[PDB]
Amino acid sequence: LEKDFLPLYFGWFLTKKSSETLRKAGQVFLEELGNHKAFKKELRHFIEKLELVSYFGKRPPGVLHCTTKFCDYGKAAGAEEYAQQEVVKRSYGKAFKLSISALFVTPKTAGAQVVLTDQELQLWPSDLDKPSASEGLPPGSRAHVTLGCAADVQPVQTGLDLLDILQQVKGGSQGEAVGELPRGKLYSLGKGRWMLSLTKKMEVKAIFTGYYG
C-alpha cells in the first residue's frame, strides 16, 4: 500500500484481456444503440448520422477501472484513513472479479454497472455513495466502469448518471423493453438514458491497487 506515499486513487483495474472484452463489448453496444429504431426516434432527446462511438470517444486515455477512493496522494479528504484500513492494506495487489450486470449510455457518459460482492464492498468507501439519488439506493450502486465520455465530461459523471439510471429503474419507470439486443434487453428510460440489461452477467478480471499516473 506504501504507508506514506499514496496514489492518485485506489480501485479495481481490469487486466489487458478483460479490459478489451468490456471495451469491445461497449463499442458494439454503442454501434447497435445508434442503429436501433428506438434510439433513432428519441434522438432529439439526446442532443447527421450521430455515430455514438465518436461521440463518446473523449474518455481520458487509460486502463478501464472501477474507482473506489480518490486520494490525490493523500490531499483528498479521508484518503489517509482509507489507505490505513486493514482490508485495504491486505488487499493491495490482490485480484478480484467484478460483475458487469448491464451497459448504459446517456447524453454525457457511457459506462458499465458493477455489482460488487460482499467482500468487494469491504473496500468500497462510505463517501462516494451519497450524491442525490443515493438516498434510497443501496450502498455501492455508484460502482461502475466508465467506457466513454462526451466532450466536456469528467469521468466522475459516469457514476452519477448510473445512480440517475438506477433511480428510475427502481421506480418501475424504465418502461418496457424497447427491443432485444443480442446481449440483452434494451430499455428506454427517457431524458436520454438507455440500458442494455445483460441476459448474462459479464465477468471481468480486475486487480485492486493504487494508480499514481
Partner: nanobody, 126 residues
C-alpha cells in the same frame, strides 16, 4: 521493464506503401496511448513531429500532411500498433519512432504510467 520493437521500413519509390509495426515486450499492464513520431534526414531528435496517434478507445489523430495517406491501427491486447502508409511522397523520408504511454505494475502491485520510445525504423522515398 518494457521494450518497444519496431518493424517494417525500407526503400520505396514515390507512390508505394509500407506498414510500420511496433510491439511492446515485457510486463505491460495496459496501453493508454500509441503514437508514431518521425525525424527527417538532418533533424536532431528535438524536431520529432507527430505522425499518427491512437488511444485505447480507438480515437485517432493525424497530421494534415499525412491525413488521408496514412492510417494508424492498433491492438491493445497485444500492445501492438501499426502505421500503414499509402501514396508515399519524398518529403515523407524519415526515421519513424514508436511512442507508447503504458500502464506498468511495479513489484508492490502499484500501477504507474510510463512513456517508452523505440529505436527507430528507416523509411526512404525515392
Amino acid at each position: 521493464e518494457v521494450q518497444l520493437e519496431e518493424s517494417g521500413g525500407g526503400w520505396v519509390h514515390p507512390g508505394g506503401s509500407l506498414r510500420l509495426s511496433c510491439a511492446a515486450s515485457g510486463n505491460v499492464f495496459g496501453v493508454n496511448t500509441m503514437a508514431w513520431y518521425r525525424q527527417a534526414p538532418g533533424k536532431q531528435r528535438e524536431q520529432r513531429e507527430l505522425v499518427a496517434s491512437i488511444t485505447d478507445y480507438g480515437t485517432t489523430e493525424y497530421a494534415d500532411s499525412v491525413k488521408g495517406r496514412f492510417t494508424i491501427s492498433g491492438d491493445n491486447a497485444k500492445a501492438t500498433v501499426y502505421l500503414q502508409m499509402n501514396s508515399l511522397k519524398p518529403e515523407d523520408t524519415a526515421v519513424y519512432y514508436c511512442n507508447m504511454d503504458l500502464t506498468v505494475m511495479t513489484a508492490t502491485s502499484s500501477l504507474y504510467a510510463y512513456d517508452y520510445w523505440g529505436q527507430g525504423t528507416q523509411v526512404t522515398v525515392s
